[PDB]
């Protein structure tokens, strides 16, 4: 449970955990899809794909190393996993690919074979992964004409028109030092890694900063992707949430836990202590749903997602759910808040502490990049337990009560009523 981080030339961050069996090293950049443009959208996803290409991947495999990378909105990360002993051979492969081979990975035979893969990849996504496709579109309309609206995997149109020069252009503007953090998780010590790094000098484009832009903003709107040939209806709905490093980051995350997630087929799920289940189970209004409090640097999204085959009662699904959310402003109970506290701790635990160093790396790098440090799991619990009913009520009265929303859906959505109908349910009549 130690968050160690020191700066010499490069800001090095590590979180050691003795019993681990393995160790992971890599760099995480403070720039992701939210830094691209509508036309070069998909560059970051492309980088990730070449970094994992058959050529580069075969080199580290001989050495007994494994590769992993993830593209997000605010950040990007390249990671190399290894045994606790080869904690040095990872640092060689890292520098070899980001300085020496930052021109060998971009050959006219590799880039074309990779481009052909992300194209079949992103296409496959839009053709079949409906729930994620919808959540991606939710960000698209909620933050339109603003950074957060750009899909992480990029659009098929900005992708097929992307050239090697664009990769370089992006890389030379974001893969800088002042916008980077070298992460090390697994078992290796902070002082073990920091030495192998402060050994090899060379700055490589120092003093350079990435370009700036215009702040992200929420806009009440919707995008309806009707498709009557699909067998279900997938919809996502949300209000403007909380950004990371916000006084209410936790109240919000707790508020989502109150309604939580559900799966109509799993017996135990049907028994949960969520009032909403009394309303939706009578006529079986949906196969599943899940609330969330997504947070980013400039903004966030608080809402839920759901999938259903009861295409003639979608208005009741949406109506009941939004009536429950009304309660957070006027009648949420102590026991509901308490049930949430326990469950939030359990999930926040399983995330920050799993048996996989790669997840730890991403989380560590991402956090240190936005707030210059990581909040310890124990420090979180103290904040979570401190939340009162009054807090939830004040938060909801600001974020949920009579506030614009964003909607997105695909499939048999004829039954999803108009905007103003849904919008009206964000409140209740009173004397």
């Amino acid at each position: 449970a130690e968050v160690t981080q020191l700066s010499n030339g490069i800001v090095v961050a590590t979180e050691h955990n003795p019993s681990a069996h393995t160790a992971s090293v890599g760099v995480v950049f403070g720039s992701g899809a939210a830094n691209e443009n509508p036309y070069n959208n998909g560059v970051s996803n492309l980088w990730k794909n070449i970094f994992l290409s058959k050529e580069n991947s075969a080199v580290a495999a001989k050495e007994g190393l494994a590769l992993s990378s993830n593209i997000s909105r605010d950040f990007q990360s390249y990671i190399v996993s290894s045994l606790p002993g080869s904690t040095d051979k990872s640092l060689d492969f890292l520098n070899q690919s980001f300085i020496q081979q930052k021109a060998n990975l971009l050959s006219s035979s590799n880039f074309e074979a990779t481009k052909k893969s992300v194209l079949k990849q992103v296409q496959d996504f839009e053709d079949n992964d409906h729930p994620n496709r919808v959540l991606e579109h939710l960000h698209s309309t909620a933050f339109q004409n603003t950074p957060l609206s750009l899909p992480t995997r990029g659009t098929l149109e900005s992708l097929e028109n992307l050239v090697v020069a664009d990769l370089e252009s992006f890389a030379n503007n974001h893969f800088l030092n002042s916008n980077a953090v070298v992460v090390g998780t697994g078992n290796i010590k902070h002082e073990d890694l920091v030495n192998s790094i402060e050994s090899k000098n060379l700055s490589l484009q120092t003093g350079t900063k990435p370009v700036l832009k215009k702040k992200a903003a929420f806009l009440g709107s919707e995008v309806r992707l009707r498709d009557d040939t699909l067998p279900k209806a997938w919809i996502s709905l949300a209000v403007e949430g909380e950004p990371v490093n916000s006084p209410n980051y936790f109240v919000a995350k707790l508020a989502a836990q109150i309604f939580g997630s559900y799966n109509a087929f799993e017996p135990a799920s049907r028994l949960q202590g969520i009032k909403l289940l009394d309303n939706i189970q009578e006529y079986q209004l949906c196969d599943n749903f899940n609330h969330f409090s997504l947070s980013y640097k400039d903004s966030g999204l608080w809402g839920f997602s759901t999938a259903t085959r009861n295409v003639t009662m979608i208005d009741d699904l949406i109506h009941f759910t939004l009536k429950q959310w009304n309660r957070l402003t006027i009648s949420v109970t102590d026991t509901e808040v308490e049930r949430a506290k326990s469950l939030l701790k359990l999930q926040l635990g399983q995330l920050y502490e799993s048996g996989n160093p790669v997840n730890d790396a991403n989380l560590l790098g991402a956090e240190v990049l936005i707030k210059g440090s990581k909040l310890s799991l124990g420090e979180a619990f103290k904040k979570i337990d401190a939340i009162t009913v009054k807090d939830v009520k004040a938060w909801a009265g600001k974020r949920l009560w009579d506030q614009d929303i964003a909607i997105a859906g695909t499939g048999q959505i004829e039954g999803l009523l108009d905007y103003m109908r849904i919008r009206s349910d964000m409140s209740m009549m009173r004397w």
């Binding site: 309309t141 009440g220 009557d228 040939t229 979608i314 208005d315 929303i405």
Partner: protein
């Protein structure tokens, strides 16, 4: 309840139209839109258009009927004045 006869209109979720696919709609909350005042400068010269295409279908039949009415009226007035008491005895009975 008792079985219902087939119609040409259903209800939300089974309205009776053909299967839709490929069409994508977008909308913005009325709350985020410019308060009602922009219905001028941009929406003024555009207006009155939906009557410049129609007035003929209304004006001609109107004109025809107005002249027919005015003609018969002026004729009536003449017939019952002094000058027309002669023609009145001709057309009357």
């Amino acid at each position: 309840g008792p079985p219902s006869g087939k119609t040409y209109m259903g209800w939300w979720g089974h309205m009776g139209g053909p299967k839709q696919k490929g069409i994508t709609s977008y909308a913005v909350s009325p709350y985020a839109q410019k308060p009602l005042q922009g219905i001028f400068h941009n929406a003024v010269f555009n207006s009155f258009r939906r009557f410049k295409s129609q007035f003929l279908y209304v004006l001609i039949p109107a004109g025809i009927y107005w002249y027919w009415w005015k003609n018969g009226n002026e004729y009536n007035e003449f017939l019952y004045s002094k000058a027309g008491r002669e023609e009145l005895e001709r057309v009357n009975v």
